[model samples]
Target chain A: DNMLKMLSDLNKDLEKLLEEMEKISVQATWMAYDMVVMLAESMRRLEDAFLNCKEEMEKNWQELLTETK
Target chain B: NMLKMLSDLNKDLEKLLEEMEKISVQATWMAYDMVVMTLAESMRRLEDAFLNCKEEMEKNWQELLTETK
Candidate 1:
């Protein structure tokens, strides 16, 4: 069972590697989620920041029209 | 259970690999969308992500080695 044993032995190494990869993949997923969430949050804030700015400017323009010149 | 565990892990890995193929495409487009949207501190945020990833992985790797024996 020398070569036969080694065949099983080979699986041991593969199993370890597989386990390592499985762990890494989950961690990678977490990392990916963080990046995606960060992008979404940043993108929303960026959009709303400009949206708010425009709304304020437009409202100021409307107020300007009401003022007697 | 050696072969069985290996089989189970292989199945999971295959599923993950297949899913990642589709996920990568969406991830690319998301990054593309953000790149177009653009930001000033983008690099800093990316740097922080990498830093956190590295630190977490290092801790995991160390613990993996310590316990696997």
Candidate 2:
């Protein structure tokens, strides 16, 4: 329950942060959007790694539960 | 239901990631140091948050495996 609720709240927080970032980007100067682009790439990588790990864990859990299921 | 919620949250995160890239590309930028300094406090926590979440997930997963093993 904590995981689920925290995940939901994290999503909402990200949405709000993105909204602020967009507004800031428009109002700011220079041209360093490239940095943010790379940040996005890094975040994507992290997401992939996390999901991969989670998938393995879930599968392992399922196997463990098999005998008791 | 658990997987559904996780998938939904991931999808929402994907939206935010995509929007960040889009806006970053479309807009001007900031004075890196100025923005960085302004953001120094809030920005610094991202590293901690990411690492903490990964560690927490792995530790819980480890506990699950350890108990059953």
Candidate 3:
């Protein structure tokens, strides 16, 4: 399942890195919100992409299983 | 149940139609940390927006949720 989850599965390894990013983002939000607006939009799109890919991947996995059995 | 999670897809498939994106799929696996850099652009933007939504932007948020249906 971890291998199947890819990015999410590997997130454990970089938890510290994201923690730093979160801090920076918060700081930037207080400083200049527009400075990070594009970045924020990008992250939103990425979440969408991640979720879309996950659903597609898992659905494909289930379909493959159903077809096999 | 398996077939229902689909909507607001990337309608912009012109790139894929013409030719596949020259992305580093397997290569990204070679050095894991570098892969995060590949997608950092969006994360920066997402963190930005998430930090600054004072008005809540409920309508667009709801639209995103509706897409899940």
Tens digits of per-residue lDDT for model 3 on B1-69?
212221222221222111111112221232264344534443333323322221122233344335523
Q: What local distance difference test score does each model get?
A: 0.39, 0.38, 0.33
Chain A only: list TM-scores of all candidates: 0.43, 0.40, 0.44
Deviation of model 3 at A58, angstroms:
0.8
Computed on C-alpha atoms, the DockQ of candidate 2 is: 0.03
Local accuracy of candidate 1 as per-residue lDDT tens digits, B1-69: 445533443444345444434333433343345445524344234323323333443454454334322
Question: DockQ (Cα-based) per candidate?
Answer: 0.03, 0.03, 0.03
Top candidate by lDDT: 1
Clashing pairs in 2: A29-B29
For residues B1-69, could you state the per-residue lDDT of candidate 2 as single tens digits? 545544543653454345445433322121122233423433334323323333443454454334323
Pick the winner on TM-score between candidates 1 and 2.
1
- Tens-digit per-residue lDDT, A17-67, candidate 3: 234333433432332323233244443453464344334433433442343
Model 1 stretches astray by more than 4 angstroms: A1-69, B11-32
Candidate 2 lDDT at B24 equals: 35
Those runs of model 3 whose alpha carbons end farther than 4 Å from true positions after fitting are A1-38, B1-69
**Local accuracy of candidate 2 as per-residue lDDT tens digits, A1-69:** 454554444344344444544443342211123223434444344344434434543443344234222
